[PDB]
Amino acid sequence: TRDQNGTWEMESNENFEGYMKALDIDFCTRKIAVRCTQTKVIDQDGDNFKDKTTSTFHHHRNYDVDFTVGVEFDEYTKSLDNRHVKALVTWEGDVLVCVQKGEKENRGWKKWIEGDKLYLELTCGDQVCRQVFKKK
């Protein structure tokens, strides 16, 4: 049949990355594009076509870590760089301090309550990231 009218949801995708490579699309765009869902709305009147395609990219990660202060533990940093470190968490006053021994030097974090907010400083080498969280 020639009638392509309808709302179409992509259910299978084969060799999208090979096609994109042939178009000289960079590895980054290919990595996001191949993870997208695709919805195609086709409005067709005889030989006249309107095609609206919506591509959607959705990312969710969960990263769960359990530890006991003072007991060195094995950490696999799956939510970041996916490396194995030997982490040791200790208290320095009211600050929670973690050294993450492994491939990277000067790697760890500090976590503390100040005001009614949670402060997190992550360090690796010469870089320090500071994050602040509020209670929900």
Restricting to residues 21-50, which ones interact with a copy of itself according to CB under 8 A?
A: 21-28, 31-33, 36, 38-40, 42, 47-50
Least Å distance, CB 37 to a copy of itself, is 9
Residue 63 contacts a copy of itself per CB under 8 A: yes
Query: Euclidean distance between the first and final Cα of the chain, in Å?
Result: 55
Residue 76 contacts a copy of itself per CB under 8 A: no
Residue 72 contacts a copy of itself per CB under 8 A: no
Least Å distance, CB 62 to a copy of itself, is 5
Residue 4 contacts a copy of itself per CB under 8 A: yes
Residue 75 contacts a copy of itself per CB under 8 A: no
Residue 50 tokens, joined: 């309107």
Answer yes or no: are the C-beta atoms of 20 and 27 closer than 8 Å.
no
Distance between CA atoms of residues 64 and 85, nearest Å: 15
Residue 126 contacts a copy of itself per CB under 8 A: yes
Distance between CA atoms of residues 113 and 135, nearest Å: 11
Least Å distance, CB 99 to a copy of itself, is 15
Residue 97 contacts a copy of itself per CB under 8 A: no
Distance between CA atoms of residues 136 and 121, nearest Å: 20
Q: Which of 74, 84, 88, 89 binds a copy of itself (CB under 8 A)?
A: 89
Q: What angle do CA 76, 136, 59 make, to 5 degrees?
A: 45
Closest CA to 77 of 105, 106, 108, 110: 108
